[PDB]
mmCIF file of C-alpha atoms and ligand atoms in Angstrom:
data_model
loop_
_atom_site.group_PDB
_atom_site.id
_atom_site.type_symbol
_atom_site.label_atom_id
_atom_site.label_comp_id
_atom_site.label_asym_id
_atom_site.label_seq_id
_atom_site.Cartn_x
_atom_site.Cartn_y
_atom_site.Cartn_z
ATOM 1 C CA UNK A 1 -93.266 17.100 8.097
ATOM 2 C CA UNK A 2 -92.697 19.496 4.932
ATOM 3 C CA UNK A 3 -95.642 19.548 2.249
ATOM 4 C CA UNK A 4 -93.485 18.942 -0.875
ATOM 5 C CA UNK A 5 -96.484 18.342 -3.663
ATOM 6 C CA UNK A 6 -97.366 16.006 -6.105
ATOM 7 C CA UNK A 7 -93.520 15.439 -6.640
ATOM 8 C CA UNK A 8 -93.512 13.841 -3.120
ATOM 9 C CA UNK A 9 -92.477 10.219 -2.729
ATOM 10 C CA UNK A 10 -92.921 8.346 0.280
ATOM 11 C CA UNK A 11 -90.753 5.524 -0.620
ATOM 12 C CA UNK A 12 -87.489 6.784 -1.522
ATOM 13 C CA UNK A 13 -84.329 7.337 0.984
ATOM 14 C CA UNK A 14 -80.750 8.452 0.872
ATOM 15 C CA UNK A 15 -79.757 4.951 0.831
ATOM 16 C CA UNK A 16 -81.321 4.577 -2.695
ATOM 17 C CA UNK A 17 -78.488 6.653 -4.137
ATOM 18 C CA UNK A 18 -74.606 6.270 -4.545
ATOM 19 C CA UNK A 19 -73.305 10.270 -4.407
ATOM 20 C CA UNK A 20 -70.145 10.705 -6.206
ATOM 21 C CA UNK A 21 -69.465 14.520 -6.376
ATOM 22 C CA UNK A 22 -70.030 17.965 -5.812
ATOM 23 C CA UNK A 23 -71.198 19.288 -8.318
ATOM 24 C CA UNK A 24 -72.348 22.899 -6.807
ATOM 25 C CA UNK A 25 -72.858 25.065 -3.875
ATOM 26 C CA UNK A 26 -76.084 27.002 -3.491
ATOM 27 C CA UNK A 27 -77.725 29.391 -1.466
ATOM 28 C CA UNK A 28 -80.666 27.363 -0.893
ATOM 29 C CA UNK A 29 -78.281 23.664 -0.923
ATOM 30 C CA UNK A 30 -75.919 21.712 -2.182
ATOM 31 C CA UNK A 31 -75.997 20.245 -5.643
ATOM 32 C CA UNK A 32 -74.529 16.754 -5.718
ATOM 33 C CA UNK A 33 -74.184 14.207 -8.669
ATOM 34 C CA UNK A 34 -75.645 10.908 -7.981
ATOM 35 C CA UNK A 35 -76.164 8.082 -8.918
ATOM 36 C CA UNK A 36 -79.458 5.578 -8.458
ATOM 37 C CA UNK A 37 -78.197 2.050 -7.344
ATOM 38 C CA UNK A 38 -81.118 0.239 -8.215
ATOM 39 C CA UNK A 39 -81.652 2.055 -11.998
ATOM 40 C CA UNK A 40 -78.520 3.026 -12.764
ATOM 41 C CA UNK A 41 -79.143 6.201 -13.653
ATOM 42 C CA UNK A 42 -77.500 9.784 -13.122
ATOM 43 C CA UNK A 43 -79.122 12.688 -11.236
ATOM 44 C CA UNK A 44 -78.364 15.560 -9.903
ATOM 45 C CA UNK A 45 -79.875 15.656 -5.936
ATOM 46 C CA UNK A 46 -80.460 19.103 -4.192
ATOM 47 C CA UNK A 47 -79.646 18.552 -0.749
ATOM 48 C CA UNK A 48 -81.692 21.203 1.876
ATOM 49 C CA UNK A 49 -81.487 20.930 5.657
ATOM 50 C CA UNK A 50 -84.884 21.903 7.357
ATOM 51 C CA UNK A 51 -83.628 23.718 10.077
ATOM 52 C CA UNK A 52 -83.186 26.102 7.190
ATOM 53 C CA UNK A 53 -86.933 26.501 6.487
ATOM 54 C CA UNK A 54 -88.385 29.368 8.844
ATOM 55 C CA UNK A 55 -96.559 24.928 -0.691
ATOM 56 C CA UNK A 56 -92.412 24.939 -0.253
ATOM 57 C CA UNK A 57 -92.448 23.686 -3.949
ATOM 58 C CA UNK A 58 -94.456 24.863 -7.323
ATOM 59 C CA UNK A 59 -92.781 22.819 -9.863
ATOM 60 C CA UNK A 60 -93.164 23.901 -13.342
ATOM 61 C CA UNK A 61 -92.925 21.649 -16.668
ATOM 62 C CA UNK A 62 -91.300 23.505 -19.505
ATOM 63 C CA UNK A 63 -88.767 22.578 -22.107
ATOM 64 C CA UNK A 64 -86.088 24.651 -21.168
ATOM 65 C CA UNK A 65 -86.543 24.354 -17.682
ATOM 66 C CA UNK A 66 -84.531 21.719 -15.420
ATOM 67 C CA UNK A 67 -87.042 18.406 -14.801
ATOM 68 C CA UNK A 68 -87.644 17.394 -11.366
ATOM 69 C CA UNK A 69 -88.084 13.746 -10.528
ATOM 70 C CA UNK A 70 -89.197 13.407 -7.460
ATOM 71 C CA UNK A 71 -88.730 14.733 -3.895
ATOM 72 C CA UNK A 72 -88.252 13.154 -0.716
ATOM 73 C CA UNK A 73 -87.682 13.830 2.876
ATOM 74 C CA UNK A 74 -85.879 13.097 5.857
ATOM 75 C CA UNK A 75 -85.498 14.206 9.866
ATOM 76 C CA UNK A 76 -83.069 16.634 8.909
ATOM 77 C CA UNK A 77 -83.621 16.986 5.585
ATOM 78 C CA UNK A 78 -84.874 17.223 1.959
ATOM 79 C CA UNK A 79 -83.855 15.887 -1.325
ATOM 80 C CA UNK A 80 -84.870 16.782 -5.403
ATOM 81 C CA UNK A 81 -83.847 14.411 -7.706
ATOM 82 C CA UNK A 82 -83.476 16.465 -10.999
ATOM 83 C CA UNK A 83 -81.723 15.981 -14.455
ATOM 84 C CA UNK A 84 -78.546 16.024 -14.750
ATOM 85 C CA UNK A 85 -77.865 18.741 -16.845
ATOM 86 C CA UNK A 86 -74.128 18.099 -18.403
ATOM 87 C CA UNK A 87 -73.261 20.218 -20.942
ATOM 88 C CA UNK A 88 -71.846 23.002 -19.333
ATOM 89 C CA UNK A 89 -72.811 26.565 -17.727
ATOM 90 C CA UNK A 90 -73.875 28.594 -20.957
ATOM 91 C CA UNK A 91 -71.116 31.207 -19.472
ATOM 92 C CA UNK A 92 -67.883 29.201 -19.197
ATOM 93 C CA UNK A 93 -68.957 28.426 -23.196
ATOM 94 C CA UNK A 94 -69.133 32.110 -23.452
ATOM 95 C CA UNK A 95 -65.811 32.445 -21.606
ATOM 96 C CA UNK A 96 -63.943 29.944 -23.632
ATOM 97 C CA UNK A 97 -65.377 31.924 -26.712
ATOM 98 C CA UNK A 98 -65.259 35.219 -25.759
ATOM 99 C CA UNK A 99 -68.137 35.824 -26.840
ATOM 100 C CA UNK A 100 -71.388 34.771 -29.263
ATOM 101 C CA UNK A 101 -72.433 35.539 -32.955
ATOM 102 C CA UNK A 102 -75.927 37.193 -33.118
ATOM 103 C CA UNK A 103 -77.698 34.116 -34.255
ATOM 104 C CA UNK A 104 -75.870 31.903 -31.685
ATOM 105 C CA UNK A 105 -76.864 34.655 -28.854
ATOM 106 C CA UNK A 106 -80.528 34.704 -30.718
ATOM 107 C CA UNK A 107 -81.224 31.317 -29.810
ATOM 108 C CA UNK A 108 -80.000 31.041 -26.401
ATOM 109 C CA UNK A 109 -81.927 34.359 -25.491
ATOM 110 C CA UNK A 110 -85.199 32.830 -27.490
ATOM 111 C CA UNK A 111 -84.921 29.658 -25.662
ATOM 112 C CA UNK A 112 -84.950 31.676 -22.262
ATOM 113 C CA UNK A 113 -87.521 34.438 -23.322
ATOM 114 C CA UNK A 114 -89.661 31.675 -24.398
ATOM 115 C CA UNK A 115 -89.190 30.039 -20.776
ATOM 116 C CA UNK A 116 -90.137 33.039 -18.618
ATOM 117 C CA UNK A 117 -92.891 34.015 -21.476
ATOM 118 C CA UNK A 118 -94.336 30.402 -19.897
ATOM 119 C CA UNK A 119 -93.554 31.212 -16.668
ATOM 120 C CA UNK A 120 -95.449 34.644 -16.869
ATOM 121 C CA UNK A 121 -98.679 33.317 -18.087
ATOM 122 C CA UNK A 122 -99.294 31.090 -14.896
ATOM 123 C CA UNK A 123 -98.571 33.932 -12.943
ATOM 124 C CA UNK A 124 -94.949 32.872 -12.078
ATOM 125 C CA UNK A 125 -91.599 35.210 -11.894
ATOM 126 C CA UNK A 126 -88.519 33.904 -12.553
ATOM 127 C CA UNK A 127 -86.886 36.451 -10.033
ATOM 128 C CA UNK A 128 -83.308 35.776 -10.029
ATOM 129 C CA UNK A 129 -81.933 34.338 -13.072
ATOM 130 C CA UNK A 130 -77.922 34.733 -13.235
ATOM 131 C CA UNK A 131 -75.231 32.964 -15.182
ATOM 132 C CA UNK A 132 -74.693 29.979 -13.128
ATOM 133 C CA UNK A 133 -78.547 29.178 -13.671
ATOM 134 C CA UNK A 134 -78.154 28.731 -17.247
ATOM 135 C CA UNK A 135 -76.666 25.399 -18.258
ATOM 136 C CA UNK A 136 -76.583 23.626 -21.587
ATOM 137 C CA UNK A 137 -77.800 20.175 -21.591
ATOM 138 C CA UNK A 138 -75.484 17.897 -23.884
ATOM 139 C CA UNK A 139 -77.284 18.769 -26.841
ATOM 140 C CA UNK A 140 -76.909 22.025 -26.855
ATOM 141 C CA UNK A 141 -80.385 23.434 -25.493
ATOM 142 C CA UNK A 142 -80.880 26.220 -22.408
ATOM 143 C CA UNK A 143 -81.902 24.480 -19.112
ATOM 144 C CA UNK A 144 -82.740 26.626 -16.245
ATOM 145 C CA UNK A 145 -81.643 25.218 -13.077
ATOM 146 C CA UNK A 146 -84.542 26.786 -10.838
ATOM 147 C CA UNK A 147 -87.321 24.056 -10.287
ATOM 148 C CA UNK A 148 -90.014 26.037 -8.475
ATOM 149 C CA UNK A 149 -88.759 25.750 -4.352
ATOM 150 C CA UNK A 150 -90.323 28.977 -2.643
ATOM 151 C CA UNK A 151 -87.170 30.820 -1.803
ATOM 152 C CA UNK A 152 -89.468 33.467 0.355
ATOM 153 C CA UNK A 153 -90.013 30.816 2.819
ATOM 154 C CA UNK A 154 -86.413 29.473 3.273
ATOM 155 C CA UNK A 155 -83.342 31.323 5.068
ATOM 156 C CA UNK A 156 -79.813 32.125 3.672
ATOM 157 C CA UNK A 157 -76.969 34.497 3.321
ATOM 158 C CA UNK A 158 -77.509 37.450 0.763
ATOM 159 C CA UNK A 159 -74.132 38.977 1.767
ATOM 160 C CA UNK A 160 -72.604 40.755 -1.137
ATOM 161 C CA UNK A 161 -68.818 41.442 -1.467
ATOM 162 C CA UNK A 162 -67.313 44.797 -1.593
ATOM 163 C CA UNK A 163 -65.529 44.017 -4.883
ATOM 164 C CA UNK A 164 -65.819 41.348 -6.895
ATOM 165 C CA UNK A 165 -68.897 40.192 -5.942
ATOM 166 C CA UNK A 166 -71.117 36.719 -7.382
ATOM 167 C CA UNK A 167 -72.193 37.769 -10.854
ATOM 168 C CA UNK A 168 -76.256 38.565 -11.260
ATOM 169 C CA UNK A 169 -77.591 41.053 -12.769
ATOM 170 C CA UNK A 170 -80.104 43.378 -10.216
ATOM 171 C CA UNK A 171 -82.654 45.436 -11.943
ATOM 172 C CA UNK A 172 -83.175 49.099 -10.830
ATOM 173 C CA UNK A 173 -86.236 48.015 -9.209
ATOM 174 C CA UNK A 174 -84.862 44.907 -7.118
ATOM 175 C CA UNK A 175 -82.087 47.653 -5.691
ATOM 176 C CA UNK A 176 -84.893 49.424 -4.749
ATOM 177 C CA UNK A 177 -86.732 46.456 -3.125
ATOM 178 C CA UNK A 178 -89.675 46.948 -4.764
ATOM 179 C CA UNK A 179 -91.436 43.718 -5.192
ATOM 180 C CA UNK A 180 -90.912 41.443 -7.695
ATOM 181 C CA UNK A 181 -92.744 41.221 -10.986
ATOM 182 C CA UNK A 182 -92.354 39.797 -14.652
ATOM 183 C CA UNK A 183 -90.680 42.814 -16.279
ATOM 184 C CA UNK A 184 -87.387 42.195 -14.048
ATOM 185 C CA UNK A 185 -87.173 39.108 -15.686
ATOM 186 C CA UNK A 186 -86.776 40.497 -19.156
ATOM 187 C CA UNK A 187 -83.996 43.283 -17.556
ATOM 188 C CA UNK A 188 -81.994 39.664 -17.007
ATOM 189 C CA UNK A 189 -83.019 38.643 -20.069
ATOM 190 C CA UNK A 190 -81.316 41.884 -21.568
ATOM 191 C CA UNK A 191 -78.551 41.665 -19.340
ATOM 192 C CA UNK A 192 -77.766 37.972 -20.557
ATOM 193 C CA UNK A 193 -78.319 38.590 -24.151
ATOM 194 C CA UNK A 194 -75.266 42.111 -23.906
ATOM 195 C CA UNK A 195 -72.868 39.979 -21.745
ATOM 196 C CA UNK A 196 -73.246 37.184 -24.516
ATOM 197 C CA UNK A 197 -72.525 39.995 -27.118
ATOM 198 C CA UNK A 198 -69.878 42.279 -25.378
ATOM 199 C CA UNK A 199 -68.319 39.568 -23.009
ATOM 200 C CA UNK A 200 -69.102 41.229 -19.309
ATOM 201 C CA UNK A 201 -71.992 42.319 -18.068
ATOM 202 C CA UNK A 202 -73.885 45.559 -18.615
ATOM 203 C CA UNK A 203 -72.769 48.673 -16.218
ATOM 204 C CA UNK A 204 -69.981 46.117 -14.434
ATOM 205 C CA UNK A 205 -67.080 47.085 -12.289
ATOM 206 C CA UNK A 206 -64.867 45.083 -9.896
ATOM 207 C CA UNK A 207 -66.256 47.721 -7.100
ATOM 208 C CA UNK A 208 -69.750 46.209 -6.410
ATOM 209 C CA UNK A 209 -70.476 49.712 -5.391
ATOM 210 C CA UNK A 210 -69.717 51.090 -8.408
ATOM 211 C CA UNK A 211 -71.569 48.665 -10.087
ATOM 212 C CA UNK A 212 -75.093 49.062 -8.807
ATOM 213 C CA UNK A 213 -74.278 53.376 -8.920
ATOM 214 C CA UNK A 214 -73.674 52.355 -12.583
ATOM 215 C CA UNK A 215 -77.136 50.222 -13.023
ATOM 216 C CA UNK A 216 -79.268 52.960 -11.035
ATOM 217 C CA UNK A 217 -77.173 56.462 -12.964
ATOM 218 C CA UNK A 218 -75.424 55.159 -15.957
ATOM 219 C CA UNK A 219 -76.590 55.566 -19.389
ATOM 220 C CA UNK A 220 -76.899 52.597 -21.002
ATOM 221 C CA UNK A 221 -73.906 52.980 -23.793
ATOM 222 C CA UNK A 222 -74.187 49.822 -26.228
ATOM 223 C CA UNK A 223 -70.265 49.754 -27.990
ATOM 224 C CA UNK A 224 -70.698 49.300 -31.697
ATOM 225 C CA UNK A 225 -70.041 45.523 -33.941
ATOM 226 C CA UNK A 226 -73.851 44.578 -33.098
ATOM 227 C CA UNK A 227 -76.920 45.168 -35.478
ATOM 228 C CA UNK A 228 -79.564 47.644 -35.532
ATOM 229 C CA UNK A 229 -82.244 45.117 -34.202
ATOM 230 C CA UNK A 230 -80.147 43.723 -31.415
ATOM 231 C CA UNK A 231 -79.471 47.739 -30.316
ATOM 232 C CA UNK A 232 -83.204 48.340 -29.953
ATOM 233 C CA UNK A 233 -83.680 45.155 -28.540
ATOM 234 C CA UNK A 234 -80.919 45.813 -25.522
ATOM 235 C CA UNK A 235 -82.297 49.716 -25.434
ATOM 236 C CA UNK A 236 -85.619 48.079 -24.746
ATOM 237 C CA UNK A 237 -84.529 45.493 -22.339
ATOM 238 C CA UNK A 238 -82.615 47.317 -20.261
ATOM 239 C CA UNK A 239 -84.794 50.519 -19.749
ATOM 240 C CA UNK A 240 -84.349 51.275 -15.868
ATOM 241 C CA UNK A 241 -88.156 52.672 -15.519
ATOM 242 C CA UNK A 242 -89.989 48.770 -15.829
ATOM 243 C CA UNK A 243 -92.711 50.773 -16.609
ATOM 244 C CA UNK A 244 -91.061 51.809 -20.334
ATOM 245 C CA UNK A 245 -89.416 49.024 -20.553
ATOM 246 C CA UNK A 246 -90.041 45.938 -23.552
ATOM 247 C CA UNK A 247 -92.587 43.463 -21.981
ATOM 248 C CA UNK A 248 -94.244 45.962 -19.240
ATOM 249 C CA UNK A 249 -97.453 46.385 -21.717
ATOM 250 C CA UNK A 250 -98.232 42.754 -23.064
ATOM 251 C CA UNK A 251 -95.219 40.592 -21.667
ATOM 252 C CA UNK A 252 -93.236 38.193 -23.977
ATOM 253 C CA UNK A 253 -95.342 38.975 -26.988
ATOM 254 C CA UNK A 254 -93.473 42.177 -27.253
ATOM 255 C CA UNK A 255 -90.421 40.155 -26.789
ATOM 256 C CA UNK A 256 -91.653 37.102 -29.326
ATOM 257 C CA UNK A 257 -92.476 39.845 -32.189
ATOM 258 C CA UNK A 258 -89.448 41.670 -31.855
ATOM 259 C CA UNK A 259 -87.242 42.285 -35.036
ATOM 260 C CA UNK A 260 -84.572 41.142 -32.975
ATOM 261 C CA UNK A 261 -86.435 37.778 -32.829
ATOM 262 C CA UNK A 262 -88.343 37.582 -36.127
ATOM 263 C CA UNK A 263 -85.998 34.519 -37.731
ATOM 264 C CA UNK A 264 -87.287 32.441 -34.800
ATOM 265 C CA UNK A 265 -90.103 30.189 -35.425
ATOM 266 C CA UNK A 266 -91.153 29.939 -31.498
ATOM 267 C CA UNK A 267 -93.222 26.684 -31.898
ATOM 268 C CA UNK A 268 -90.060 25.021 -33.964
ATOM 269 C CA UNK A 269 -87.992 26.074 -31.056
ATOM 270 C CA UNK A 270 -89.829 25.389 -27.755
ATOM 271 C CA UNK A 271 -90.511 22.269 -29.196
ATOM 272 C CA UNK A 272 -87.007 21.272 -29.706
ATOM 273 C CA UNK A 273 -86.931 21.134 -33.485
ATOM 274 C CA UNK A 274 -83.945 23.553 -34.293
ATOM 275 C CA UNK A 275 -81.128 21.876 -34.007
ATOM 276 C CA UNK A 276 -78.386 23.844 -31.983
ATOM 277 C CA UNK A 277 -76.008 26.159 -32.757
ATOM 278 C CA UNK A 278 -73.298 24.670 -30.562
ATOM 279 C CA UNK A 279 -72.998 20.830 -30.041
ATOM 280 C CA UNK A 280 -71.075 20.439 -26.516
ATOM 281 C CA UNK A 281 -68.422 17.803 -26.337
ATOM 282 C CA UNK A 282 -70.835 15.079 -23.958
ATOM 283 C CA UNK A 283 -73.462 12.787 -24.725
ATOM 284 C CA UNK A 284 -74.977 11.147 -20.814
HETATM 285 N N1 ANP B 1 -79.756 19.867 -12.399
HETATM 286 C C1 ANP B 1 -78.440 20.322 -12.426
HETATM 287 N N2 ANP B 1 -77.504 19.705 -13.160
HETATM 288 C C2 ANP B 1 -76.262 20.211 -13.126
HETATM 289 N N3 ANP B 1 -75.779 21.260 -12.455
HETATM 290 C C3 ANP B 1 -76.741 21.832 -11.738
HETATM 291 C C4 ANP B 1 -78.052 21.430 -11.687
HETATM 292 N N4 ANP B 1 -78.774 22.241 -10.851
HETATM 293 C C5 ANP B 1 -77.915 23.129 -10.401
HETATM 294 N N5 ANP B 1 -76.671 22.921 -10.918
HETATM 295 C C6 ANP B 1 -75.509 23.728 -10.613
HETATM 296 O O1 ANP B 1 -75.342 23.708 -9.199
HETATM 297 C C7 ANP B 1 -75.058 25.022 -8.712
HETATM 298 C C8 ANP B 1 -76.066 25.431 -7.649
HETATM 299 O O2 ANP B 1 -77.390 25.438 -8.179
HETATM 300 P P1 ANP B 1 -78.258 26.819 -8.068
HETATM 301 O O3 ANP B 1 -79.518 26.609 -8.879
HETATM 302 O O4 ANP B 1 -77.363 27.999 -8.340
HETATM 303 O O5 ANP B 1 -78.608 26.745 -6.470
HETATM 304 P P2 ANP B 1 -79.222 27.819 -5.395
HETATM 305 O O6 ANP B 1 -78.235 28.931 -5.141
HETATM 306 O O7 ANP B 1 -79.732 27.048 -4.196
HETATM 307 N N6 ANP B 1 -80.612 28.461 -6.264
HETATM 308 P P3 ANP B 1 -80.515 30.116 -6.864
HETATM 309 O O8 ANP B 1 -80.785 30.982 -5.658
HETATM 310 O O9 ANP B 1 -81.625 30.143 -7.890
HETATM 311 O O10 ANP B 1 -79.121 30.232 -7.431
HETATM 312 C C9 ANP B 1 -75.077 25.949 -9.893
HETATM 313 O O11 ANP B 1 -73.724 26.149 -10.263
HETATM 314 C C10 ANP B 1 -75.771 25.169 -10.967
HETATM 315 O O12 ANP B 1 -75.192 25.404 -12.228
HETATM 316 MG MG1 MG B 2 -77.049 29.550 -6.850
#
């Protein structure tokens, strides 16, 4: 018997829901679209086995992050019942596109900053955001697909491919295994907001090799067709010492007040009152 917080419901069973699809694999389980047959309603259901397990779950209200349900529990195993967030990963947009406009890469990187700025000030760390953890819902807002299950407390495969490896972008520090705290969430945050500007990620090559020699040794050489502000912005962000690097002194203010950022009105956007750049194609 897992302790799965106030999210835990007693009541509810696999029986209570028709699954139609895969809709993901994860390192941590399976992501399946489903379907509630009493309410009629869509979720997505993260599926865990507890043989896998060796609080489990802190989970955290924000705008911009994905909305658990419930949870529930079986023999073998454990369910979330989450949104079902439909409007595409932000980077197969970004693929289709090649890449973003400054003020469409602006307020995907505000909506995240201002989600790990949140996340920060109750002493949370995002750890490991990558692409496929930033989704658009079908309006056109970020959702974050992480809903607070304590990874450090649940086994898995962290093999990593010679070349060609599952895109995620490791700060100097994680290489290092130093442990983990809020300033390696704004080197993601940097590394999302250049791959939405220059179309791969920062320091990449198909040798995986080669790319962490590259994040660890490599000058950071920005290509030009950006502005000034998003240049000192990305120079910031992706400082390899976390201890020079924009955030390590007072955290997302010194991402919230930067030039970069000064168009965004942060209480208009966290609460969902600028309308999107990008409408995607889906309304469900
Ligand atoms: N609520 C959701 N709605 C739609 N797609 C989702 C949802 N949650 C996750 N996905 C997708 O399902 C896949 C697996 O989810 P993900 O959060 O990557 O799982 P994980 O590997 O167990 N956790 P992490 O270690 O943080 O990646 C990803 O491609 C997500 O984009
Ligand atoms: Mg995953």
């Amino acid at each position: 018997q897992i302790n799965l917080g106030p999210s835990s419901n007693p009541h509810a069973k696999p029986s209570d829901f028709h699954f139609l699809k895969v809709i993901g694999k994860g390192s941590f389980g399976k992501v399946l679209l489903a379907r509630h047959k009493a309410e009629e309603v869509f979720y997505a259901v993260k599926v865990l086995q507890k043989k896998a397990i060796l609080v489990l779950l802190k989970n955290v209200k924000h705008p911009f992050l994905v909305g658990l349900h419930f949870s529930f529990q079986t023999a073998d195993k454990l369910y979330f019942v989450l949104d079902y967030i439909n409007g595409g990963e932000l980077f197969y947009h970004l693929q289709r596109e090649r890449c973003f406009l400054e003020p469409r890469a602006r307020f995907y990187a505000a909506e995240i900053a201002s989600a790990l700025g949140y996340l920060h000030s109750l002493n949370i760390v995002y750890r490991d955001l990558k692409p496929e953890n930033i989704l658009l819902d079908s309006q056109g807002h970020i959702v974050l697909t992480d809903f607070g299950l304590c990874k450090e407390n649940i086994e898995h495969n962290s093999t990593t491919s010679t070349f060609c490896g599952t895109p995620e972008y490791l700060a100097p520090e994680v290489l290092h295994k130093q442990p983990y705290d809020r300033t390696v969430d704004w080197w993601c945050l940097g590394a999302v907001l250049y791959e939405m500007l220059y179309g791969l990620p920062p320091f990449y090559s198909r040798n995986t090799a080669e790319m962490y020699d590259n994040i660890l040794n490599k000058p950071l050489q920005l290509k030009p067709n950006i502005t000034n502000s998003a240049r000192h912005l990305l120079e910031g962000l992706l400082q390899k010492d976390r201890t020079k690097r924009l955030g390590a002194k007072d955290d997302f203010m010194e991402i919230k007040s930067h030039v970069f950022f000064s168009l965004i009105n942060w209480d208009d956007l966290i609460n969902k009152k600028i309308t999107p750049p990008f409408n995607p194609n889906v309304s469900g």
